[PDB]
Design an enzyme around this catalytic site. Structure first.
Site, PDB file in Angstrom:
ATOM      1  N   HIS A   1       0.806  -1.218   0.000  1.00 60.10           N
ATOM      2  CA  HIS A   1       0.000   0.000   0.000  1.00 60.10           C
ATOM      3  C   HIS A   1       0.843   1.273   0.000  1.00 60.10           C
ATOM      4  O   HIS A   1       0.288   2.369   0.138  1.00 60.10           O
ATOM      5  CB  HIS A   1      -0.982   0.004   1.184  1.00 60.10           C
ATOM      6  CG  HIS A   1      -0.353   0.289   2.514  1.00 60.10           C
ATOM      7  ND1 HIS A   1      -0.068  -0.701   3.429  1.00 60.10           N
ATOM      8  CD2 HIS A   1       0.018   1.455   3.096  1.00 60.10           C
ATOM      9  CE1 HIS A   1       0.463  -0.160   4.512  1.00 60.10           C
ATOM     10  NE2 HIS A   1       0.529   1.147   4.334  1.00 60.10           N
TER      11      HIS A   1
ATOM     12  N   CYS B   1       4.669   1.113   9.134  1.00 66.29           N
ATOM     13  CA  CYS B   1       4.513  -0.047   8.271  1.00 66.29           C
ATOM     14  C   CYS B   1       5.840  -0.419   7.628  1.00 66.29           C
ATOM     15  O   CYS B   1       6.647   0.444   7.273  1.00 66.29           O
ATOM     16  CB  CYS B   1       3.465   0.229   7.196  1.00 66.29           C
ATOM     17  SG  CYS B   1       1.802   0.375   7.840  1.00 66.29           S
TER      18      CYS B   1
ATOM     19  N   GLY C   1       3.816   5.791   9.274  1.00 67.55           N
ATOM     20  CA  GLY C   1       5.169   5.584   8.814  1.00 67.55           C
ATOM     21  C   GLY C   1       5.883   4.404   9.431  1.00 67.55           C
ATOM     22  O   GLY C   1       7.082   4.233   9.184  1.00 67.55           O
TER      23      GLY C   1
HETATM   24  C1  LIG Z   1       1.672   2.119   7.596  1.00 65.71           C
HETATM   25  O1  LIG Z   1       2.868   2.752   8.033  1.00 65.71           O
HETATM   26  C2  LIG Z   1       0.468   2.473   8.462  1.00 65.71           C
HETATM   27  C3  LIG Z   1       0.600   1.980   9.916  1.00 65.71           C
HETATM   28  C4  LIG Z   1      -0.522   2.485  10.830  1.00 65.71           C
HETATM   29  C5  LIG Z   1      -0.647   3.991  11.013  1.00 65.71           C
HETATM   30  C6  LIG Z   1      -1.413   4.136  12.320  1.00 65.71           C
HETATM   31  N1  LIG Z   1      -1.025   2.933  13.046  1.00 65.71           N
HETATM   32  C7  LIG Z   1      -0.494   1.991  12.266  1.00 65.71           C
HETATM   33  O2  LIG Z   1      -0.075   0.890  12.656  1.00 65.71           O
HETATM   34  N2  LIG Z   1      -0.721   1.890   7.841  1.00 65.71           N
HETATM   35  C8  LIG Z   1      -1.861   2.561   7.671  1.00 65.71           C
HETATM   36  O3  LIG Z   1      -2.006   3.725   8.032  1.00 65.71           O
HETATM   37  C9  LIG Z   1      -3.013   1.797   7.015  1.00 65.71           C
HETATM   38  C10 LIG Z   1      -2.931   1.904   5.493  1.00 65.71           C
HETATM   39  C11 LIG Z   1      -3.912   1.015   4.732  1.00 65.71           C
HETATM   40  C12 LIG Z   1      -3.934   1.370   3.255  1.00 65.71           C
HETATM   41  C13 LIG Z   1      -3.554  -0.451   4.915  1.00 65.71           C
HETATM   42  N3  LIG Z   1      -4.290   2.293   7.498  1.00 65.71           N
HETATM   43  C14 LIG Z   1      -4.656   2.103   8.770  1.00 65.71           C
HETATM   44  O4  LIG Z   1      -4.002   1.427   9.558  1.00 65.71           O
HETATM   45  C15 LIG Z   1      -5.966   2.764   9.209  1.00 65.71           C
HETATM   46  N4  LIG Z   1      -6.877   1.777   9.762  1.00 65.71           N
HETATM   47  C16 LIG Z   1      -8.109   1.611   9.280  1.00 65.71           C
HETATM   48  O5  LIG Z   1      -8.620   2.328   8.443  1.00 65.71           O
HETATM   49  C17 LIG Z   1      -8.908   0.428   9.831  1.00 65.71           C
HETATM   50  F1  LIG Z   1      -8.610  -0.698   9.203  1.00 65.71           F
HETATM   51  F2  LIG Z   1     -10.212   0.620   9.700  1.00 65.71           F
HETATM   52  F3  LIG Z   1      -8.665   0.221  11.117  1.00 65.71           F
HETATM   53  C18 LIG Z   1      -5.801   3.975  10.179  1.00 65.71           C
HETATM   54  C19 LIG Z   1      -7.172   4.603  10.445  1.00 65.71           C
HETATM   55  C20 LIG Z   1      -4.882   5.036   9.566  1.00 65.71           C
HETATM   56  C21 LIG Z   1      -5.203   3.524  11.514  1.00 65.71           C
END
Ligand SMILES: *C(=O)[C@H](C[C@@H]1CCNC1=O)NC(=O)[C@H](CC(C)C)NC(=O)[C@@H](NC(=O)C(F)(F)F)C(C)(C)C
Ligand SMILES: *C(=O)[C@H](C[C@@H]1CCNC1=O)NC(=O)[C@H](CC(C)C)NC(=O)[C@@H](NC(=O)C(F)(F)F)C(C)(C)C
Lengths: 292, 300
Positions: B40, B143, B141
């Protein structure tokens, strides 16, 4: 979530060395052209015997290796600073970081890099308790392992392991060679100060529980108690006067509004939790719980 | 003493890199001549849109830097394996150790090397839960951070972080690109299975308490319950069938002997604690922890 955070051991691993002297083997850290290790590798001496016993230790007997760089260092000068040995060697450690010898106050945390034969095997988290002992895990040959923290690029060294006591406690020196507490590197029974709970850390642990596990648990006290009434109770119940560190208040205050539970209730809960009583109740510092 | 032991992170720091793609930034690990990072980083796509979007992704847009070695990497080819991107670079990582992609089973532990901008900032310990989630701590950041174990010389990679759910739970893939559980890298609400305690690890927690804190605490049950009578209770109280792993009995039977407390008293203590705990703090926890594995408590 809220976890026990440790500092990456990579910078410490590149500096660890093994120090073997006439059958005795322990660890040491290599900074610039000096290797710091506990002094009892030359033998088990007492009191003021150390000055003279270090004076006659020939440098050719100090076998020093740094396995992570595959180089065996040669000792030229040997100097005792406190209860440590400063071994001056010819080769400067290219992996030396910007560092600082910072002494820990009780209640603060640090990362132990448990090492054997000059190689770090485990890292774990400890907090210096009010008796100036850490509750760690060490086997033979682990002396010389360091406790450290990291602030950006700088390595903050706080501890070097020396001795283990009967009640699963451990004591050592700072990197300047001074023990934490009235303890020495002698295999005799040494009187310990009575244990006291670092109250700020107990409060930080409960708040971490309310922020991750249960926002309103059943054992949580419903009534408040003043800090003053708590501190009078604490003087007879082996709890340190609150607050331990005035700088912990901005953390605890922020934690209490995040949790919507005033610290007065947490303090009261601590008093009501004495019904249910080493303990490991002070591993959570307010800074570590608030910052994360 | 008996501590939560983490594996030394230096091997992982020397292989961490940062991957930035059109304003999106996360971490990556660099072994041999390939960089692995979550997919992603090129966008927030759904379903089967990934294979087309990756195939049109320009390799010149991947800004890959290894800050611990002062090297900026150039990407030759990009291929998606599972939910991960394998970015082939022209330079072989000299610090690449003997490694192995090993998928964890629930109940096992691993050390998380939480990194930002290619540099690891915090290391901590997690256990894969029966819901195929880990209870960790990550921000934006982060991931690309990996969970790992070490068996002497070989580095065992288990996990790469991808997503955080509302209840402070985190999910990702193993290093082969496949998630743990029915979770995917999409920002929508995904059903999680009900939480269930890894019984072997809760047993290891109480044994750890008996071996370093208090040998005969007031909450340790005096009477026993049989494994079968426990498993009947376990099916109605969110506890897994005991034992979760047959290989944990050799460790648990060892802990029974040196603590002089058979596992039947530990299991009956678990049942009593669910009704008469009232704030008891076991091993520094006011909660039932699955972080203590029988192997870690017994070996150290
Ligand atoms: C990649 O570095 C981040 C790691 C996240 C950031 C906040 N805490 C973490 O562990 N990945 C994301 O932000 C991820 C990207 C997607 C395209 C996979 N999105 C999320 O983790 C979101 N979660 C959701 O939307 C949920 F699945 F509904 F929970 C948030 C809202 C940014 C945490
Ligand atoms: C140095 O690497 C060893 C390691 C010890 C043993 C396991 N835990 C450790 O940390 N340190 C010693 O052997 C030390 C030598 C002194 C000259 C400093 N002695 C001890 O730690 C002993 N403890 C005592 O005799 C005591 F202080 F009375 F408790 C034991 C008996 C070896 C643990």
């Amino acid at each position: 979530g809220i976890k026990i955070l440790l500092h990456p051991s990579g910078v410490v691993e590149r500096c660890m060395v093994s120090v073997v002297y006439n059958g005795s083997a322990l660890n040491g850290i290599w900074l610039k052209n000096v290797v710091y290790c506990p002094r009892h590798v030359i033998g088990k001496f007492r009191g003021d015997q150390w000055t003279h016993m270090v004076s006659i230790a020939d440098c050719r007997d100090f076998i020093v290796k740094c396995p992570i760089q595959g180089i065996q260092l040669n000792v030229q000068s040997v100097k005792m600073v406190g209860a440590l040995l400063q071994l001056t060697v010819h080769t400067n450690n290219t992996a030396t970081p910007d560092y600082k010898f910072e002494r820990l106050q009780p209640g603060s945390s640090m990362t132990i890099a448990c090492a054997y034969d000059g190689i770090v095997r485990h890292v774990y988290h400890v907090v210096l308790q009010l008796n100036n002992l850490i509750y760690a895990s060490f086997l033979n040959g682990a002396c010389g392992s360091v406790g450290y923290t990291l602030k950006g690029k700088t390595l903050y060294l706080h501890y070097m392991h020396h001795i283990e006591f009967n009640n699963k406690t451990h004591s050592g020196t700072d990197l300047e060679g001074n023990f934490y507490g009235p303890y020495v590197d002698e295999e005799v029974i040494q009187q310990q100060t009575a244990f006291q709970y670092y109250t700020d850390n107990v409060v930080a642990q409960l708040y971490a529980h309310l922020l991750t596990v249960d926002a309103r648990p059943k054992w949580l006290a419903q009534s408040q108690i003043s800090i003053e009434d708590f501190n009078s109770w604490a003087a007879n119940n082996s709890f340190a006067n609150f607050p331990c560190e005035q700088t912990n208040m901005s953390y605890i205050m922020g934690l209490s509004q995040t949790a919507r539970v005033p610290v007065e209730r947490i303090l009261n809960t601590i008093i009501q939790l004495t019904t249910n009583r080493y303990d490991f109740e002070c591993d959570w510092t307010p800074e570590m719980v608030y910052n994360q």
